[PDB]
């Protein structure tokens, strides 16, 4: 829910909304969501924000066929 709202969101912004533990705890949990291809995003540790890798425009691929 929080990933679809903000494409680029800070690491500490997730812990404020969901009242999580710390930044190292959410860093592990977000990595679990893209395991099966659900969220399809990437985590930038040096930049400090999680960016979504989905540009849509999937019609150019073979998925419609």
């Amino acid at each position: 829910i929080i990933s679809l709202t903000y494409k680029k969101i800070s690491l500490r912004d997730i812990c404020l909304k969901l009242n999580l533990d710390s930044e190292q705890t959410v860093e592990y949990m977000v990595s679990r969501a893209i395991r099966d291809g659900v969220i399809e995003a990437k985590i930038n540790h040096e930049d400090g924000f999680i960016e979504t890798t989905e540009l849509l425009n999937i019609y150019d691929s073979e998925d419609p066929q």
Partner: protein
């Protein structure tokens, strides 16, 4: 250049008199054609054979009588006056000094350039049993004009009554793919390796096809945009395949009605 259009009546009529004379492979039949050569598209509406005699051991020996040609032209004026002599044909696959030297003989009675024709009796390969060849004075070379087969409304269907979908249409596609393969490999291997003929005049036209997986890999990125129309065709077809379920669901009422009547 010019174009050639020959009706199917002319092509098969030339093959009939070949067997009627019991002509073997050592002999060949020569004849004349009629039509209108004035326009850019040469049309052949008629053909007549000739008593052609040739020696098999000498290419300089031939028998051609123009008196039969002069009489033939006078006999045609009483049948069809709109037809004039546009050239002459001949049989046999081989081209020897007999058919090459007589090309100027028919030129006296033909206003345009006589159109040479090789009628294949065995019909070996592809289509077009007869090839239309034209000669130039400037060096002489035999060039083939875009010969096509076309007739009138009653003439095209007339042979259909005497002779008498998607997968079949694709069968002819593979035959054209092997035509690209077999024509280039056999010809190119003859120019290279052993026995180089005088060439590089034709090579300029051959490589003119290859420049424009024979075509272009530079559009591969743009091809996906060209493929989009193909993907669009599957958008509606998915419903078209579902449109077959419309009748499939309506036809369910028929059998359900049969169970009620039963």
């Amino acid at each position: 250049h010019e174009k050639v259009t020959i009706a199917p009546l002319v092509l098969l009529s030339a093959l009939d008199h070949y067997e009627r004379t019991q002509t073997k492979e050592n002999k060949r039949c020569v004849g004349v054609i009629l039509g209108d050569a004035n326009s850019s598209t040469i049309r052949v509406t008629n053909s007549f054979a000739l008593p052609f005699e040739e020696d098999e051991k000498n290419s300089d020996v031939w028998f051609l009588d123009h008196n039969y040609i002069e009489n033939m032209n006078e006999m045609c004026k009483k049948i069809n006056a709109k037809e004039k002599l546009i050239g002459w044909y001949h049989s046999g696959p081989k081209l020897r000094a007999s058919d090459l030297k007589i090309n100027e003989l028919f030129k006296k009675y033909t206003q345009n350039n006589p159109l040479l024709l090789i009628v294949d009796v065995k019909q070996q390969g592809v289509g077009l049993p007869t090839d239309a060849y034209v000669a130039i004075e400037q060096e002489k070379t035999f060039l083939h004009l875009p010969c096509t087969i076309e007739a009138e409304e009653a003439e095209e269907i007339g042979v259909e009554h005497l002779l008498r979908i998607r997968l079949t249409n694709q069968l002819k596609s593979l035959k054209g793919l092997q035509s690209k393969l077999k024509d280039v490999v056999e010809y190119l291997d003859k120019v290279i390796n052993k026995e180089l003929p005088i060439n590089h005049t034709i090579l300029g036209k051959l490589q003119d096809v290859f420049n424009l997986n024979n075509l272009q890999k530079a559009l591969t990125v743009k091809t996906n945009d060209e493929l989009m129309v193909i993907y669009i065709s599957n958008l509606v077809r998915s419903i078209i395949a579902f449109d077959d379920l419309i009748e499939n669901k309506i036809q369910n009422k028929k059998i359900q009605e049969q169970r009620v009547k039963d």
